[PDB]
Amino acid sequence: SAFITFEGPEGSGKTTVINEVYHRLVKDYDVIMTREPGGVPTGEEIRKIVLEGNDMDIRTEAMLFAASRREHLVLKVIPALKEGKVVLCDRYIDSSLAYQGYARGIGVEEVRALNEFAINGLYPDLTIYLNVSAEVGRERIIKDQEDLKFHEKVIEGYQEIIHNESQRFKSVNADQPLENVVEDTYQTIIKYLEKI
Amino acid sequence: SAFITFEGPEGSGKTTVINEVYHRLVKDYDVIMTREPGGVPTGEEIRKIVLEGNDMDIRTEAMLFAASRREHLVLKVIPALKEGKVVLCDRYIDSSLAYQGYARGIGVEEVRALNEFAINGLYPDLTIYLNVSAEVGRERIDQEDLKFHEKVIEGYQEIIHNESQRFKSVNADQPLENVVEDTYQTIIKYLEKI
Ligand SMILES: CC[C@H](c1ccc(C(=O)O)c(Oc2cccc(Cl)c2)c1OC)N1CCC[C@H](n2cc(C)c(=O)[nH]c2=O)C1
Ligand SMILES: CC[C@H](c1ccc(C(=O)O)c(Oc2cccc(Cl)c2)c1OC)N1CCC[C@H](n2cc(C)c(=O)[nH]c2=O)C1
């Protein structure tokens, strides 16, 4: 089994990359694609609260992302791993670190301690970081100043997380055309998987 | 202003005591009594999720109690404290420490780290612990329920041993009129010294 997470800002080509990699991996592996809350009833109820939030306190929002994360992990991810599946997960702990910790200003270490409570040691086996520049990402989103700066800070946050901790992290150049980003991601995954 | 929390297992007469103490304190102080979620919409929605939980993972449950704690703190407690009020809160961080941390077995220090993210330094000024023996508590209320009850009491003892200065323990084995009186006097002594 393998728990593989995908990280990156918006405009990193993440949706295309996961879908195309899934289509190639299913030839050799029992693979699933997922994202939080991913159909888990409690997680879906949490998601409704977050999306209905009127200027929700950023720490309450972080705790709700973390509670949705745990429900998705325990009720969907772990049973799939037990079946021997390759789980392709769109966003996990690192999104809360980059978005809640860095971009929203809570503090990466405070958000880390919260999410370590949530995942209880279950870190991804492999994390694909779709490393897009802010300018390329901006163009992919189009195809506001506060939004542009928020997108910039998300990337700055990811840069901080990957520069500090790196072992499961595999950075893929997402400034390339998407066919190349798919090929580099697929090859990175196959290299990991074929080493058991 | 003062933020005073009330803690204890079931059977400690905690609800009755806080209600009576609050009714007496309103005569001399600008005071409110509340509990989580306490009407805050997001907290109420989180409460519904917890109550609807079918064998809910204990850490998800702890995170939801912590999210309800923050909403109630931010929208009710902090605005009242800024208005200079005495805030009486029935159950706070120590309830998550005793129940989720100790009794459910996640670990007090793990649950403390989670709750410190939720309260962001807003610990109670004073915590009233209604110290009921497991035997009196049992009587005031099967093997599993009695074992969980004893575990909560044991958890509260460990917490109070580690943070003696924040707690004031009231003998909850006495008749409730005495528990009310000792709790009231403990609070007044604290309020008249600040
Ligand atoms: C509004 C922010 C946005 C977003 C977009 C779509 C959904 C939606 O599902 O319709 C969404 O709701 C979610 C998603 C995941 C988990 C929950 Cl509980 C609610 C959402 O966050 C509220 N952004 C998009 C970029 C990534 C952001 N994000 C994601 C995760 C997983 C995290 O931990 N932190 C974070 O800020 C959310
Ligand atoms: C079933 C557990 C029970 C309890 C009783 C009544 C309510 C109810 O409101 O009807 C309740 O729901 C709540 C209460 C507070 C906050 C939320 Cl989000 C939900 C509840 O916990 C699910 N016990 C009773 C003993 C104390 C327990 N407790 C309380 C708090 C505040 C905590 O942090 N941890 C904990 O285990 C809950």
Q: What DSSP string describes chain A?
A: -EEEEEE--TTS-HHHHHHHHHHHHTTTS-EEEEESSTT-HHHHHHHHHHHT-SS--HHHHHHHHHHHHHHHIIIIIHHHHHTT-EEEEES-HHHIIIIIIIITSS-HHHHHHHHHHHHTT---SEEEEEE--HHHHHHHHH--HHHHHHHHHHHHHHHHHHHHS-SSEEEEETTS-HHHHHHHHHHHHHHHHTT-
A64: chain B residues, CB-CB within 8 Å:
67
Q: What's the gap in Å between A73 CA and the centre of ligand 2? A: 24
Contact (CB<8Å) A63/B60 = no
d(CA B115, CA B92): 10
My answer on whether omega of the bond before B9 falls inside 30° of 0, hence cis, is no
Q: Which atom of ligand 2 is nearest to the CA of B66?
A: 33
Of all residues in chain B, the one with the smallest CA distance to A49 is B42
Q: Is residue A15 a known part of a binding site?
A: yes
Q: Which atom of ligand 1 is nearest to the CA of A91?
A: 31
Amino acid at B5: T
Q: What's the gap in Å between B46 CA and the centre of ligand 2? A: 11
Contact in structure between A5 and A89 (CB atoms under 8 Å): yes
Buried b (16+ CB within 10 A) or exposed e, A60-86: bbbbbbbbbbbbbbbbbbeebbeeebb
**Residue B121 CB partners (closer than 8 Å, separation 6+):** none
Number of structural domains in chain B: 1
Choice from B15, B42, B91 to test ligand 2 binding pocket (greatest atom count within 8 A of CB): B91
If we measure between CA atoms, which residue out of A136, A138, A141 comes closest to residue A177? A136
Q: Tell me what percent of chain B is helix, strand and coil, each rounded to the nearest 5.
A: 60, 15, 25
d(CA A44, CA A77): 15
A74: chain B residues, CB-CB within 8 Å:
57, 60
Q: Is residue B118 less than 8 Å (CB to CB) from chain A?
A: yes
For A104, B60, B114, the CA distances from A114, given in Å and listed in that order, are 15, 12, 6
First to last CA, chain A: 9
Closest partner residue to B42 (CB to CB) among A60, A70, A71 is A60
Strands B2-7 vs B126-131: parallel, antiparallel or unpaired = parallel
Q: What's the gap in Å between A109 CA and the centre of ligand 2? A: 29
Owning domain of residue A37: 1-196
The tally of CA atoms less than 13 A away on the side-chain side of residue A17 is: 36
Q: Is residue B64 less than 8 Å (CB to CB) from chain A?
A: yes
- What six digits make up the tokens of A46? 């949490």
Per the listing, tokens 């798919």 go with: A182
In CATH, what number is assigned to the domain containing residue B155?
Answer: 3.40.50.300
DSSP-H helix ranges across B84-175? 93-96, 108-119, 134-140, 143-162
In a 3-state reduction of DSSP, which class is residue B19? helix
Buried b (16+ CB within 10 A) or exposed e, B52-91: eeeebbbbbbbbbbbbbbbbbbbbbbeebbeeebbbbbbb
Strands B31-35 vs A126-131: parallel, antiparallel or unpaired = unpaired
- Residues 131 to 190 of B: which have CB under 8 A from any A CB? none
Q: What's the gap in Å between B34 CA and the centre of ligand 1? A: 32
What resolution in angstrom units was achieved for this structure?
A: 1.8
If we measure between CA atoms, which residue out of A95, A99, A73, A52 comes closest to residue B59? A73
Contact (CB<8Å) A67/B67 = yes
Sign of the Cα torsion A139, A140, A144, A148 reads negative
- What six digits make up the tokens of A179? 């066919």
The tally of CA atoms less than 13 A away on the side-chain side of residue A46 is: 30
d(CA B132, CA B10): 9
The tally of CA atoms less than 13 A away on the side-chain side of residue B47 is: 15
Strand partners, A6: A90, A128
Contact in structure between B11 and B140 (CB atoms under 8 Å): yes
Contact in structure between A7 and A129 (CB atoms under 8 Å): yes
Contact in structure between A103 and A58 (CB atoms under 8 Å): no
